[PDB]
Amino acid sequence: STKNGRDSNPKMLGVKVYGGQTVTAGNIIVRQRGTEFHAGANVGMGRDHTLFATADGVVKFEVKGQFGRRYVKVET
Amino acid sequence: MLQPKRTKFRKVHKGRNTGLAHRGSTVSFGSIAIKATERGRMTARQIEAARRTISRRIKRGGKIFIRVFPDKPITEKPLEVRMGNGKGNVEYWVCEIKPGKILYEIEGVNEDLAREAFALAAAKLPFKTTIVTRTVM
Amino acid sequence: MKTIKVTQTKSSSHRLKNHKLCLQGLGLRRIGHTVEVQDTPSNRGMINKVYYMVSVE
Amino acid sequence: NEKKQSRLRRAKSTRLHIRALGATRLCVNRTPRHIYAQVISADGGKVLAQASTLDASLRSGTTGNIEAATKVGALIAERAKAAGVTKVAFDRSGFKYHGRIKALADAAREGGLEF
Amino acid sequence: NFVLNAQARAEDKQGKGASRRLRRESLVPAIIYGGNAEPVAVTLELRELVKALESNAFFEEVVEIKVGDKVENVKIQALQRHPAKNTPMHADFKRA
RNA sequence: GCUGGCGACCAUAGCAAGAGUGAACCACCUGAUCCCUUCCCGAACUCAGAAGUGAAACCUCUUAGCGCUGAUGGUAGUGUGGGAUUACCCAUGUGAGAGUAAGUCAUCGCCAGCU
RNA sequence: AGUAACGGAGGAGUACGAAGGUGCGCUCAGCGUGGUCGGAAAUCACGCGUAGAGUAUAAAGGCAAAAGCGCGCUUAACUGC
RNA sequence: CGAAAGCUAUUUAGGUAGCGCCUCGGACGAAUACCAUAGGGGGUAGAGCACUGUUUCGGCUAACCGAUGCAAACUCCGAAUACCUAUGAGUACUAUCCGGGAGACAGACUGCGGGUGCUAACGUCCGUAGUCAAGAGGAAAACAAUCCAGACCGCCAGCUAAGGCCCCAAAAUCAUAGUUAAGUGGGAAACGAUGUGGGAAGGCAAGUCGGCCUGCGCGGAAGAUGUAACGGGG
Ligand SMILES: C[NH+](C)c1cc(NC(=O)CNC(C)(C)C)c(O)c2c1C[C@H]1C[C@H]3[C@H]([NH+](C)C)C(O)=C(C(N)=O)C(=O)[C@@]3(O)C(O)=C1C2=O
Ligand SMILES: C[NH+](C)c1cc(NC(=O)CNC(C)(C)C)c(O)c2c1C[C@H]1C[C@H]3[C@H]([NH+](C)C)C(O)=C(C(N)=O)C(=O)[C@@]3(O)C(O)=C1C2=O
Ligand SMILES: C[NH+](C)c1cc(NC(=O)CNC(C)(C)C)c(O)c2c1C[C@H]1C[C@H]3[C@H]([NH+](C)C)C(O)=C(C(N)=O)C(=O)[C@@]3(O)C(O)=C1C2=O
Ligand SMILES: [Mg+2]
Ligand SMILES: [Mg+2]
Ligand SMILES: [Mg+2]
Ligand SMILES: [Mg+2]
Ligand SMILES: [Mg+2]
Ligand SMILES: [Mg+2]
Ligand SMILES: [Mg+2]
Ligand SMILES: [Mg+2]
Ligand SMILES: [Mg+2]
Ligand SMILES: [Mg+2]
Ligand SMILES: [Mg+2]
Ligand SMILES: [Mg+2]
Ligand SMILES: [Mg+2]
Ligand SMILES: [Mg+2]
Ligand SMILES: [Mg+2]
Ligand SMILES: [Mg+2]
Ligand SMILES: [Mg+2]
Ligand SMILES: [Mg+2]
Ligand SMILES: [Mg+2]
Ligand SMILES: [Mg+2]
Question: Which portions of the sequence form the region Disordered (chain A) (predicted)?
Answer without folding.
Answer: 1-12
